[PDB]
């Protein structure tokens, strides 16, 4: 499986009259989930749950209701796996992967925000054929190409490739040039955006150079973030 960030308290009890929601995002074999735990720290039950997300950059929306079907009793905790899809309304967020959520019960409507790790939006069919990669790389205007240093990285090229592939970042080609490993990689987002990469791993050099080309270059910074998180974990 891909990288999953540690669970975080998205909505602490103190902000929601005893309601506490902690969660993380996963991508399982097709499918995006918001994996959550709901705890009622109040003295009265909570029921009539509903959820909606603000319009957001990748059109993320719940695909089912919250699986909470009876009152959540004082001091009770329930684990809830909420499937999501990317067929909902779109609006640019800042940061790009920010997600504003509204949860209501019988007591009130509460609001929190959380970042969607950009990796959970990497699709399975993101492996570009070699020759299409070549044509696509050449076609993206070179002013779109942005370079990042993945600093202080102590992994080898095979481990780099294997970790990235576990997260739907595919190594399409490999070359060794002057003792430096060159990996050519591709990924595609849920909204159809293709990102192409050249990663250069140099002798005893602790900084890898990551060159990204994307027709939407504002996304590239976010992809660098992701590579860094994957390779550091």
């Amino acid at each position: 499986g891909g990288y999953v960030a540690p669970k975080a308290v998205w909505l602490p009890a103190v902000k929601a009259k005893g309601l506490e929601i902690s969660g993380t995002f996963t991508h399982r074999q097709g499918h995006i989930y918001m994996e959550m735990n709901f705890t009622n720290k109040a003295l009265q039950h909570m029921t009539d749950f509903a959820i909606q997300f603000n319009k957001n950059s990748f059109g993320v929306i719940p695909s089912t209701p919250l699986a909470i079907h009876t009152p959540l009793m004082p001091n009770q905790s329930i684990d809830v796996s909420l499937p999501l899809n990317t067929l909902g309304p779109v609006m640019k967020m800042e940061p790009l992967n920010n997600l504003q959520v509204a949860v209501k019960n019988n007591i009130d409507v509460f609001y929190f925000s959380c970042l969607i790790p950009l990796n959970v939006l990497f699709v399975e069919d993101g492996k570009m054929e070699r020759q299409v990669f070549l044509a696509t790389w050449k076609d993206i205007p070179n002013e779109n190409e942005l370079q990042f240093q993945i600093k202080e990285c102590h992994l080898n090229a095979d481990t780099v490739s294997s970790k990235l592939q576990n997260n739907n970042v595919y190594t399409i080609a490999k070359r060794n040039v002057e003792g430096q490993d060159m990996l050519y990689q591709s990924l595609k987002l849920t909204n159809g955006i293709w990102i192409l990469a050249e990663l250069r791993i140099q002798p005893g050099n602790p900084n890898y150079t990551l060159s990204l080309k994307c027709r939407a270059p504002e996304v590239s910074q976010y992809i660098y973030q992701v590579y860094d998180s994957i390779l550091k974990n």
């Binding site: 009539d48 749950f49 909606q52 603000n54 209701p65 009876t70």
Partner: peptide, 15 residues
């Protein structure tokens, strides 16, 4: 806070 529309709420069924 952000503005919510009633029809965008995804309500849980009650058993």
């Amino acid at each position: 806070y952000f503005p919510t529309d009633e029809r965008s709420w995804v309500y849980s069924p009650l058993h």
